Amino acid sequence: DIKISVVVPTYNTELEGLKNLMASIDKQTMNPDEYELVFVDDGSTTDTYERLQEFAETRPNMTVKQIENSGWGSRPRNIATKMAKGEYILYLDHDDTVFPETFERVYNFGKENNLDVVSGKEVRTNGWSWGWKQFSENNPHAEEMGIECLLPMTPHKFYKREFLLENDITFDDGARVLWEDVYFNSKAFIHGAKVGILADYPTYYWIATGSFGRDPHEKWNQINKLFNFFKDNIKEQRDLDFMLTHWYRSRVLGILGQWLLKNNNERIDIEFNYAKKLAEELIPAYISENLDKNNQVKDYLLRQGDLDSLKKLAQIDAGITALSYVEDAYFKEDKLFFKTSTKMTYEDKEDFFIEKTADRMERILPEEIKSKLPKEFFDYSDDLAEFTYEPSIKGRNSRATWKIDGSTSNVEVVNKKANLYKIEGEMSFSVQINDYILDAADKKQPWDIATRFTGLGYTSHRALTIGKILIKTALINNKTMIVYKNASGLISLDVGSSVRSIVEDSGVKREQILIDKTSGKVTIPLNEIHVFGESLIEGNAELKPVGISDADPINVKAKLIGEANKARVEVLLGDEKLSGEYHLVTNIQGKKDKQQIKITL
């Protein structure tokens, strides 16, 4: 009885990525006799198929099959699905990895709620978020929210196999199309799939590694295809209007902003006319009535054919952002506290302004463009209460991103001079690092802090920064922690000495080093460090006689102790016979200090 079948379409697969894929399957906590691997090679011209069979030699649950080159992964995915026999199917691409507890957590969640689709938290290499809104909390009855529950609509979810077969849900083979996973997930929801969102554990790592669509005529052929599919197949009004709104905003209106400043005039004219024709033919007017002000402006000028005004608006909007600065950062008890501030600016320089005229707060525009727009489309008066300001964290090893919960933030619209108003935010939050340590590997990792600011239609998710020097250490319940300004001026948090030495960053009270030569113990107290709870981290140290340049290191035991709000390194000389002056270098958790410690024995 197989719980999970992993479908992997391969073609000229990079072997190192394939090794990492197979490794992440083997590390699954689930019993290997409870899942199967179904590999279908899509006519790889390299030696991937022979390597795939080689992997299957020592794995009885792995099936490999060769097919004539299909061109994409839709054909091999369908073939593997028909020959799969597991209760749930994960479509895993040949260059991605799975987290070690995914199979168990996803299946238990799925079986307990009789789900047809488990949308588990997906992780990407780049960016400060992925599925920020959808992966916010676990939802076993996610389909009640509508078709939005399946976003982001990647195929890297777990689908009940019997549900796919029963409604004949397959990938578009013999049809090269764009966003085939949008089609796939839409058909699943159209057929009434019971959807569950598993948000408290990263399940899939979609890795960035580095042709179809590039061409503007092919791209807008696929876009007309996607929108017609929405209009022809989605029968729920709420679901149809969400998909129309979401894809009109992101892919159609999405070229009428900064995209205009990064393309040549030939491509702009070609894609602008496609967008105007698609808006008129497929997008009802009520769709834009529920868009933000700046998108309503873009939709109005698009349907007027006013590309020149859109190009001008893009120059005006170029650079609007919200960067956060650290106002204060310190450890308290078992947590790290932050106070941050931000304000809307151009490129983190001069303030971004809105302007008050009579009883309206208006976007600042030249008179030439305001006279072409409906009065309400540049009146922000009703949107001044919709700002959000939140902190987030990202593990530099795992690439997993999380919102930091419990934050307190406020955003004010402030009159700076005359009738000009700026937008200022202040926030305070704390990090409890255990909230984000889910696999053992997470305990030794650098973490990078960011902030997410939204308002007036703009989204700015950027790394937290600070100007002044910042290095602060903590020893909290056996966790070495170092918050610091990194080389890019951004805020990082080393936990477990993955990048920095806590002894080096804390300093040493060299005049307070104690040598008990009868007990053979050298006590090295740490200078500046926040100590909470009891800690004992075992490590080692190295002694070298001063002067003897090429002397062998004398390896000895050492342990970083946190006790009664103070920290120290105890070095144990053991059975070594020592006389004279020695260089002492501590090695806690793989990081050596640079404190130039010398002791006389």
Ligand X SMILES: Cc1cn([C@H]2C[C@H](O)[C@@H](COP(=O)(O)OP(=O)(O)O[C@H]3O[C@@H](C)[C@H](O)[C@@H](O)[C@H]3O)O2)c(=O)[nH]c1=O
Interface with its own copies includes 598 (CB under 8 A)? no
Which three-class secondary structure state does DSSP give residue 407? coil
Within residues 489-518, the interface with Cl ion by CB under 5 A covers 492, 499
- Give which of its own copies, Mg ion, ligand X, none residue 325 binds (C-beta under 5 to 8 Å, depending on kind): its own copies
- Give which of Cl ion, its own copies, Mg ion, none residue 465 binds (C-beta under 5 to 8 Å, depending on kind): its own copies
Annotated binding residue 348: yes
Interface with its own copies includes 492 (CB under 8 A)? no
In the complex, which residues of this chain contact ligand X (CB under 6 A)? 9-11, 42, 69-73, 76, 93-95, 154-155, 180-181
- Give which of Cl ion, its own copies, Mg ion, none residue 95 binds (C-beta under 5 to 8 Å, depending on kind): Mg ion
Q: How far is the CB of 391 from its own copies (least distance, A)?
A: 16
Q: How far is the CB of 585 from its own copies (least distance, A)?
A: 15
* Closest alpha carbon to 509 in 458, 566, 563: 566
* Closest alpha carbon to 560 in 588, 583, 592: 588
Which one of 33, 269, 327, 581 is in contact with its own copies (CB under 8 A)?
327
Which one of 29, 31, 46, 315 is in contact with its own copies (CB under 8 A)?
315
Annotated binding residue 141: no
Annotated binding residue 93: yes
Q: Where are the alpha helices (DSSP H) in 234-264?
A: 237-247
CA angle 449, 454, 459 (to 5 degrees): 80
Instruction: At 480, list the tokens.
Output: 């070495």
Which three-class secondary structure state does DSSP give residue 477? coil
The total of other beta-carbon atoms located within 10 Å of residue 321's CB is: 17
Mask: binding to its own copies, 262-291, rule CB under 8 A, as x and -?
---x--------------------------
Annotated binding residue 325: yes
**Span of 45-53, 163-171, 296-304, 339-347 interacting with its own copies by CB under 8 A:** 339-347
Interface with its own copies includes 528 (CB under 8 A)? no
Q: How far is the CB of 448 from Cl ion (least distance, A)?
A: 8
Q: Are 525 and 511 in contact (CB under 8 A)?
A: no
- Give which of Cl ion, Mg ion, ligand X, none residue 348 binds (C-beta under 5 to 8 Å, depending on kind): Mg ion
Annotated binding residue 94: yes
DSSP 526: B
Output phi, psi for 273, to 5 deg: -70, -40
- Give which of its own copies, ligand X, Cl ion, none residue 547 binds (C-beta under 5 to 8 Å, depending on kind): none
- Give which of Cl ion, its own copies, ligand X, none residue 377 binds (C-beta under 5 to 8 Å, depending on kind): none
Q: How far apart are CA 6 and CA 91, in angstroms?
A: 6
- Give which of Cl ion, Mg ion, its own copies, none residue 93 binds (C-beta under 5 to 8 Å, depending on kind): Mg ion
Q: How far is the CB of 223 from Mg ion (least distance, A)?
A: 23
- Give which of ligand X, Cl ion, Mg ion, none residue 154 binds (C-beta under 5 to 8 Å, depending on kind): ligand X
Instruction: At 519, list the tokens.
Output: 């007990």
Q: How far is the CB of 416 from its own copies (least distance, A)?
A: 10
Which three-class secondary structure state does DSSP give residue 318? coil
Annotated binding residue 206: yes
Q: Are 37 and 61 in contact (CB under 8 A)?
A: yes
Q: How far is the CB of 153 from ligand X (least distance, A)?
A: 9
**Span of 130-138, 229-237, 341-349, 519-527 interacting with its own copies by CB under 8 A:** 341-349
Burial classification of residue 360, based on how many CB atoms lie within 10 Å of its CB (0-12 exposed, 13-18 middle, 19 or more buried) = middle
Cα 49 to chain centroid, rounded = 32
Q: How far is the CB of 461 from its own copies (least distance, A)?
A: 18
Interface with Cl ion includes 486 (CB under 5 A)? yes
Annotated binding residue 108: no
Q: How far apart are CA 229 and CA 180, in angstroms?
A: 11
* Long-range CB pairs of 513-521, under 8 A, 24+ apart, other chains included: 513/597, 513/599, 515/599, 515/600, 515/601, 517/573, 517/601, 520/572, 520/573, 520/574, 521/570, 521/571, 521/572, 521/573
Nearest to its own copies of 72, 272 (CB atom): 272
Q: Which residue lies nearest ligand X, judged by its C-beta? A: 73
Nearest to its own copies of 316, 499 (CB atom): 316
Q: How far is the CB of 492 from Cl ion (least distance, A)?
A: 5
CA angle 218, 221, 222 (to 5 degrees): 90
- Give which of its own copies, Mg ion, Cl ion, none residue 600 binds (C-beta under 5 to 8 Å, depending on kind): none
Half-sphere exposure of 69 (CA within 13 A, CB side): 6
Quick one: how many helices (H) and strands (E) in the chain?
A: 14, 31
Interface with Mg ion includes 593 (CB under 5 A)? no
* Long-range CB pairs of 414-422, under 8 A, 24+ apart, other chains included: 415/356, 416/351, 416/353, 419/355, 419/356, 419/357, 420/353, 420/354, 420/355, 420/356, 421/353, 421/354, 421/355, 421/356, 421/361, 422/343, 422/344, 422/351, 422/352, 422/353
Q: How far is the CB of 368 from its own copies (least distance, A)?
A: 11
Annotated binding residue 11: yes
Interface with its own copies includes 47 (CB under 8 A)? no
Q: Are 4 and 91 in contact (CB under 8 A)?
A: no
Instruction: At 472, list the tokens.
Output: 């602060």
Nearest to ligand X of 64, 588 (CB atom): 64
Q: How far is the CB of 543 from Mg ion (least distance, A)?
A: 48
Interface with Mg ion includes 14 (CB under 5 A)? no
Q: How far is the CB of 208 from Mg ion (least distance, A)?
A: 8
Annotated binding residue 156: yes
Q: How far apart are CA 556 and CA 544, in angstroms?
A: 11
Q: How far apart are CA 598 and CA 600, in angstroms?
A: 7
Interface with its own copies includes 337 (CB under 8 A)? no
Which residue precedes each gap in the chain (C to N above 2.5 Å)?
210
Nearest to Cl ion of 290, 488 (CB atom): 488
Q: Contact residues for Cl ion (CB under 5 A)?
A: 486, 492, 499
Binding-site sequence positions for Mg(2+): 95-96, 325, 348
Q: Contact residues for its own copies (CB under 8 A)?
A: 265, 315-316, 318-319, 325-327, 341, 345-350, 465-469, 489, 596
